[PDB]
Amino acid sequence: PHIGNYRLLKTLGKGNFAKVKRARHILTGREVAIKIIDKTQLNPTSLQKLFREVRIMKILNHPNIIKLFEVIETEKTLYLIMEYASKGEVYDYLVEHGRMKEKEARSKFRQIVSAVQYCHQKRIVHRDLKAENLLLDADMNIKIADFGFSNEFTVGSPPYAAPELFYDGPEVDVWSLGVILYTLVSGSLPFDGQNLKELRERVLRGKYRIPFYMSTDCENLLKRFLVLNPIKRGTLEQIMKDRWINAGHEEDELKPFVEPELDISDQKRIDIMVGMGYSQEEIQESLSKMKYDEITATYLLLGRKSSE
Amino acid sequence: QPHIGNYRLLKTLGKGNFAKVKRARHILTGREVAIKIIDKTQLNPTSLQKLFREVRIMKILNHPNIIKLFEVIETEKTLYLIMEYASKGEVYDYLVEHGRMKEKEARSKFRQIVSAVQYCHQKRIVHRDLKAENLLLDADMNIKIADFGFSNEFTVGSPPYAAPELFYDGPEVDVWSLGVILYTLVSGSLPFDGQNLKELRERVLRGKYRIPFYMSTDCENLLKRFLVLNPIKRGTLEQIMKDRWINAGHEEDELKPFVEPELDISDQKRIDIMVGMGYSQEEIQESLSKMKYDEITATYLLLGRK
Ligand SMILES: CN1CCN(c2ccc(Nc3ncc4cc(C#N)c(=O)n(C5CCCC5)c4n3)cc2)CC1
Ligand SMILES: CN1CCN(c2ccc(Nc3ncc4cc(C#N)c(=O)n(C5CCCC5)c4n3)cc2)CC1
Numbered sequence: 001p002h003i004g005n006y007r008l009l010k011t012l013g014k015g016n017f018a019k020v021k022r023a024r025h026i027l028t029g030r031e032v033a034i035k036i037i038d039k040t041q042l043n044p045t046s047l048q049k050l051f052r053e054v055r056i057m058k059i060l061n062h063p064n065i066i067k068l069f070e071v072i073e074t075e076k077t078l079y080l081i082m083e084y085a086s087k088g089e090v091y092d093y094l095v096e097h098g099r100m101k102e103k104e105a106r107s108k109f110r111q112i113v114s115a116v117q118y119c120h121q122k123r124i125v126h127r128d129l130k131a132e133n134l135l136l137d138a139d140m141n142i143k144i145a146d147f148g149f150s151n152e153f154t155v156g157s158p159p160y161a162a163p164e165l166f167y168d169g170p171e172v173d174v175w176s177l178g179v180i181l182y183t184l185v186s187g188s189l190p191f192d193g194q195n196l197k198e199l200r201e202r203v204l205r206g207k208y209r210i211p212f213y214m215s216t217d218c219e220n221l222l223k224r225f226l227v228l229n230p231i232k233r234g235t236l237e238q239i240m241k242d243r244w245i246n247a248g249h250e251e252d253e254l255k256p257f258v259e260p261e262l263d264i265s266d267q268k269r270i271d272i273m274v275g276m277g278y279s280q281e282e283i284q285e286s287l288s289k290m291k292y293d294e295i296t297a298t299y300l301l302l303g304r305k306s307s308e
Numbered sequence: 309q310p311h312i313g314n315y316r317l318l319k320t321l322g323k324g325n326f327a328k329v330k331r332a333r334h335i336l337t338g339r340e341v342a343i344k345i346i347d348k349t350q351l352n353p354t355s356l357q358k359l360f361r362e363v364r365i366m367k368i369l370n371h372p373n374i375i376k377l378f379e380v381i382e383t384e385k386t387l388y389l390i391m392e393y394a395s396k397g398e399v400y401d402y403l404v405e406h407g408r409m410k411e412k413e414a415r416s417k418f419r420q421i422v423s424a425v426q427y428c429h430q431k432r433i434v435h436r437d438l439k440a441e442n443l444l445l446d447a448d449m450n451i452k453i454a455d456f457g458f459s460n461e462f463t464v465g466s467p468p469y470a471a472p473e474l475f476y477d478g479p480e481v482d483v484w485s486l487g488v489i490l491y492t493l494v495s496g497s498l499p500f501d502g503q504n505l506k507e508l509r510e511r512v513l514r515g516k517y518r519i520p521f522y523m524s525t526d527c528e529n530l531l532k533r534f535l536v537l538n539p540i541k542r543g544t545l546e547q548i549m550k551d552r553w554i555n556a557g558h559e560e561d562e563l564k565p566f567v568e569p570e571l572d573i574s575d576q577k578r579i580d581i582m583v584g585m586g587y588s589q590e591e592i593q594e595s596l597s598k599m600k601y602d603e604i605t606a607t608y609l610l611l612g613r614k
Contacts, residue, residue: 055540123432123478231361231364
């Protein structure tokens, strides 16, 4: 089975009003993830919120945020065609290999901090960063899923939730980032329990174990995220200057991401799409207007590696 | 007249929700001020924490057209916010007394308003409830906007000024209200009104308003940049600051984002006066350097005004 130019493959997750399937673009062979939302199960209020959030997704253009390629809408269904992170959860990588060495943890956490700060600068707060939406692509780059989407439009976390949720501003992501950092360096959650009430007591206590292998610089950095009072947490713009974050990046200090200009005049890719049956003029119109249609999707997918 | 801190309390200016605002006089300098009074025992631990977050925001508002905070007094039961007093009250009262502002005067005030709001937006502070009740005028007819950064329950939203999407907390909602504000300055009337809230909402959603004979096309063009139903298509304030009508008569003085003056905390003339009032030199230097918003920094600031 298919939708538009995509062959639908196995379901990756399901829940609430959404399903996400792996899929293969027929025109290019590139793999994608497709979120399928049955609109008949939504009231007019949820429908309006969904389309506002889709418009937010169209403005996320960061190399560590799952990228939207194409939107297909029928009378009954919304299809969101987006980047597929072929290695699944960071958690799966921690299970296989153990904790990351601090050099690898730093490389991935710089990507995560960049992605989240980039959204915060645009007034977009995740509010639900967790194991299930921290993903890795085929080249071990971080890809964060579901920025900007309300939980009912995700497939579906107490260990990561800020203690003030136990508030919807950027500080709640900063707490979750501290949990993430701790999981990267130790392979363990900083706060756990035999049930939710014990988990909550430990989160409110704010204390977590520092293993012998954790550097003092990593410990000090965690203290900037895992502060109970939300207003005393560091800002990401401040944390970007942290000594641990930039160890080994002497003249490459982490700074807010700046979007490169999108090259929409690659004639090699345009030549391929003309072969596919699109006209040069049609291609230029879709790309310059960024229509999120079958043409812009194809152009972007032709820029990725084949057969994956 | 009772005292709180170094202030003599005078007439009540307003009361609503969890707040009361009184006119007062600083005993030490004789300067008039406004004091917002909030009984903390009215609040839960959650709203009390939010109140303190919004006071921390108020501390960083330093714009000549934004009501300036002078002093914070917190007791076990009550929070007192001592701030600038706008002695001529609401812009509305001026419109009632003199009618619509002529174009030059409306432009002058609207530049102040746009400057104040853009200054807050750049600091990522959205008002969300700009309205007649918090657009004020000082003794020199300068705009003073009240209650930036405060939730409604801490003030003493408003259908005629509320963006149609509230019938969202980003700057776009202020931009819509600014359009309604500009219309009131130029016409003396609200653009959207009705015999009840239902009819009023209908006109906001339609987005149509009467263009009077005295409104220029440049002014009508500017209105179209605020009063857009689609929030994403509304002008941004950085863009609106370059509008032709906004800068007419200001060709070598284009409206730009406000930049705060460098703070002067070592005026020894004012410090000398405060030593005479009984504060020590060391105390004064510490209060000013740490910007404590205590009785000392407030006196320092009030000594710098008429
Ligand atoms: C032991 N593992 C094995 C499978 N494994 C997993 C495999 C691939 C991926 N990739 C991938 N790429 C893009 C995505 C976009 C989304 C959106 N919007 C989205 O929700 N998802 C997932 C996240 C929640 C479930 C659907 C996306 N997933 C994620 C996980 C996890 C368990
Ligand atoms: C027919 N009129 C008669 C006069 N009258 C009026 C007179 C003076 C002023 N000034 C002034 N200066 C600072 C203020 C700080 C505030 C804070 N925070 C605050 O709330 N207020 C007001 C605004 C809402 C009621 C309290 C402030 N008001 C306002 C109005 C209006 C009616």
